[PDB]
Each structure stands twice: as structure tokens, then as C-alpha cells.
Amino acid sequence: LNSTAQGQLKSIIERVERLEVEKAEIMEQIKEVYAEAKGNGFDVKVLKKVVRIRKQDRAKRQEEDAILDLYLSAIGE
Amino acid sequence: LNSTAQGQLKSIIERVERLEVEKAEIMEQIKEVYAEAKGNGFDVKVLKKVVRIRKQDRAKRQEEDAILDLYLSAIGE
Amino acid sequence: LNSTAQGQLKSIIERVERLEVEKAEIMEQIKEVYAEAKGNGFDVKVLKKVVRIRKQDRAKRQEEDAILDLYLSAIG
Amino acid sequence: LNSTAQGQLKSIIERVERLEVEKAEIMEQIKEVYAEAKGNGFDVKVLKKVVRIRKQDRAKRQEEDAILDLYLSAIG
């Protein structure tokens, strides 16, 4: 490669690595939060469920819940 | 639940949501970096490959490369 | 390597590849099944949800649903 | 729903569940195969690497390896 692409390559790699570090840090902090959360007697799986359903559209969520209920009753299961 | 667990639940949820936001932001920034990187004529897949192999132990990496080469030659493929 | 390990390696690789092919077939067929499911006006995502929750223990399922609802009501 | 869609739903669910079971069998067998592979002193990860790279086009594989090496040499 040329000197330009060499320096650009080093730059890109370094910036990406830094961002990955910050990202990893955030992830670890989240894990810490869930750890103390479990440290207060909360169900982490259910908490993650709440987080997952609070990102979804409420209308489509309640829709999928209604359809779900419908399907479960439709088969007797 | 009791008022304590209610407030703690709200707190946990809010903090986790914030951390998720920061995390998402970091991810988006990474995507931006790879976008301008591709904007300079670089192979993003290969870049990700470099990032992935720069996290691994060099000794075990070169090991797996030697073993790989060995296996490929062993079968004529 | 020695010739023995070479032939054995070829064997292993072939075995794994064949199993991977069969796995691919299964996945493709499943894809076709869900396509047939939506072709009759069914929600594929919800169907997958039904399948995934039928793998879980029912008592723990209705339990986790109860805890979920409890928390959601706790925060509105 | 109507009785027809109820029976059809039962059918679909059963079909999907059976396919999932067969898929599980395939995965379990693969697990057994790699266990047999390491039982003869082979690197399972590297074997999986061989399998995964044999799915890719060889020209593009050796090409991506060349670009990789080029970049790594470019940065040492």
C-alpha cells in the first residue's frame, strides 16, 4: 500500500478498537447493574424480558399477545 | 410489591435503558467509522477480520493457522 | 501428518459436511413450512413464539408471565 | 378462530415441532462427531474452521486471505 492508506489503516483500526473498548465498558456496567439488581432479589431474566418488551411497539405487542392467546386457546394447549 | 421495590425497579430499568442508549450510540459510531472506511476504498469484512484476529492470542492464532495449513495439506484440499 | 491421519481427516471432514447438508435441508423445509403457514394468514413470529414456549416448562412459563405482569403493573 | 383453523393450527404446530426435533438430532450427532474428532487428538475449532471455509468460494477465500495478509503486513 501507499503511506496514505497505511496511516488511514492505522487510524481506522485504532478508532474502532477504542470504540469497542468503550462499548465493552458499557456492557460490563450493564452486567454490574444486573448483578446488584439480582443483589436486591429481582429476577434478571424477567427484567431482561421487560427491557425487551419496552422497546417494542405497544400496539403490536398487545397484538402479538392477543394472537398468542388466541392460538393457545385454539389448540387447547 | 412494596414502595421500596417499586422505586428500585424504576431505578434499575432507567439505568439499564440509559446504558443501552450509550451502547447503541457507540455501535452507531462504529458503523459510521466502517462507513467512511469503506468510503476510503477499504474492505470492511477484511477489516473486521483484522479486528477479530487482533483480539486473539498471537501464539494460539499462529498455532491455529499452522494446524489449519497442516489439515488443508493433509487432505489435498 | 501421517497417511492414516490424512485419510481419517478426510473421513471426518466428509462426515461433518454431510451432516451440515442435512441440517441445511431441515432449515430449508422449516422455512417452507412457515411460508405455508403465512400463506394461510397466520402470524409466523407468533407461531415461532408458540413453538419456543412449548419447549419451556409450562409452570415456569406461566410463572414468568406472572412475574412479568407483576413488574409491569408495578411500573404501569 | 373456527374449528378448521384450530385443527390446521394443531397440524402446523406439530409439523414444526417434529422438524425441530429432527434438527436437534442432527445437532446432537454433530456434537458427537466433533467429540469423536477430538478423541483422536484433533483441534475441533480448526476443524469447524475448515468446514466453514469449504462453504465459501475458494478464489474469494484465498483472495481475502491475501488482503488480510496485505493489511497485516501494512501495519506489521
Numbering used by the authors:
A (entry chain B), B (entry chain B): 12 to 88
C (entry chain A), D (entry chain A): 12 to 87
What does the paper say about this structure?
GapR is an essential NAP in Caulobacter crescentus involved in DNA replication, chromosome segregation and cell division. In this paper we present three crystal structures of GapR from C. crescentus, crystallised in the presence of double-stranded DNA with a sequence from the origin of chromosome replication. In all three structures, GapR adopts the same overall tetramer ring form as seen by Guo et al., albeit with small but important increases in the diameter of the central channel. DNA could not be visualized in any of our three structures, but DNA could be detected in gel electrophoresis, indicating that DNA is present in the crystals.
For this, we used both full length GapR and GapRΔ1-11 (a construct in which we removed the first eleven residues, that were predicted to be disordered) and a 19-bp dsDNA oligomer with a sequence from the C. crescentus origin of replication, which GapR binds with a nanomolar dissociation constant. We were also able to solve the structure of GapRΔ1-11 from crystals of space group P4322. Diffraction from these crystals also showed high anisotropy, with resolution limits between 3.3 Å and 3.8 Å. Following ellipsoidal truncation and anisotropic correction using the Diffraction Anisotropy Server10 the structure was refined to an Rfree of 0.322. There are six monomers in the asymmetric unit, arranged as a tetramer and a dimer. The tetramer could be overlaid onto the I4132 tetramer with an rmsd of 1.9 Å. Crystallographic symmetry again showed that the dimer of the asymmetric unit paired with symmetry-related molecules to form tetramers. Furthermore, in the I4132 and P4322 structures, a 19 bp DNA oligio would have to adopt substantial bends to thread through the central channel of adjacent tetramers, because channels formed by adjacent GapR tetramers do not line up. The main difference between GapR in the three crystal forms arises from slight changes in the orientation of helix three, which results in minor variations in the size of the central channel.
